[PDB]
Amino acid sequence: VLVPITEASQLPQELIHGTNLQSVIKIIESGAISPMSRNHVHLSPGMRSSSNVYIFIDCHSPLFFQTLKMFRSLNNVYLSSSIPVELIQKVVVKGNLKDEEKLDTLRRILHERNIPLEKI
Ligand SMILES: NC(=O)c1ccc[n+]([C@@H]2O[C@H](COP(=O)([O-])OP(=O)(O)OC[C@H]3O[C@@H](n4cnc5c(N)ncnc54)[C@H](O)[C@@H]3O)[C@@H](O)[C@H]2O)c1
């Protein structure tokens, strides 16, 4: 069962969507993190073990609850409506030597949208 999240005071300190480098490029280019198979986008308070990309949602955006409908399951996982990339606070990628070309792409699209990228 899910309960509603309607006030910023209920948002954790960070809200993270774990993914890989190929999805985060598709995410930025299509303009939104979409629920896909599931009915909601799954977010971890701050994931698949193979997730090397971490998308931080800006929990302090004045437009947060005008853009997302937010829920929380009893085991503390946050479920949301489509998240526009413009609500993305920061994208953190664990670098792999094999993905150096994709990261240059990610660097450009994120700058074009003024989303900061951090490579660890
Ligand atoms: N992703 C997280 O950080 C997170 C948070 C908490 C728990 N979980 C757990 O993980 C499972 C959910 O799987 P999931 O979160 O990987 O999602 P999912 O299994 O439904 O797979 C959807 C995939 O599509 C990607 N995607 C989203 N928007 C896209 C777009 N516009 N273009 C291309 N790709 C896009 C997502 O990043 C994700 O990799 C559940 O068991 C859930 O409890 C996930």
User: According to the 3-state scheme, what is the secondary structure of the chain?
Assistant: CEEEECCHHHCCCCEEEEECHHHHHHHHHHCEECCCCCCCEEEEECCCCCCCEEEEECCCCCCHHHHCCEEEECCCCEEECCEEHHHEEEEEECCCHHHHHHHHHHHHHHHHCCCCEEEC
Q: What is the resolution of this structure in A?
A: 2.2
Structure tokens that stand for 6 in this block: 């309607």
**CA-wise closest residue to 43 among 67, 65, 21, 12:** 12
Q: Which residue type, as a one-letter code, is found at position 40?
A: H
18 lines ligand 1 (CB under 6 A): yes
Q: Which atom of ligand 1 is nearest to the CA of 17?
A: 3
- How buried is 16 (Cβ within 10 angstroms: 0-12 exposed, 13-18 middle, 19+ buried)? buried
Experimentally determined by = X-ray
> What CATH number does the domain located at 2-119 have?
3.20.170.30
31 lines ligand 1 (CB under 6 A): no
